[PDB]
Amino acid sequence: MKPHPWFFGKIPRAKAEEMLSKQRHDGAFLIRESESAPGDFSLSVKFGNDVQHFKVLRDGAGKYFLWVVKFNSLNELVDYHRSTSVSRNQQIFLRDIE
């Protein structure tokens, strides 16, 4: 197997913003470890000339989610959002960084 190209570990929100504004495609994303909330993960995605940040939520049963659909791992949440918008008002489908 190959490592995932979307995990960046603990990088500043600003650095994620910086590198993502330079991407050419909508949906370009990365998962980072939140510096504001230790133990939390954040999804940073580019759409248009904008860069948005989503907090990966975890519920009482230990599952991950953004809005309503729950998953068992960050892997599945990410893969599911490659064909389901990550936002309720814009159609942002995750696409690997390039």
Binding site: R13, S36, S42, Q52, H53, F54, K55, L57, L66, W67, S87
Partner: peptide
């Protein structure tokens, strides 16, 4: 504080 589209 930092803000998130889903929070």
């Amino acid at each position: 504080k930092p803000f998130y589209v889903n929070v």
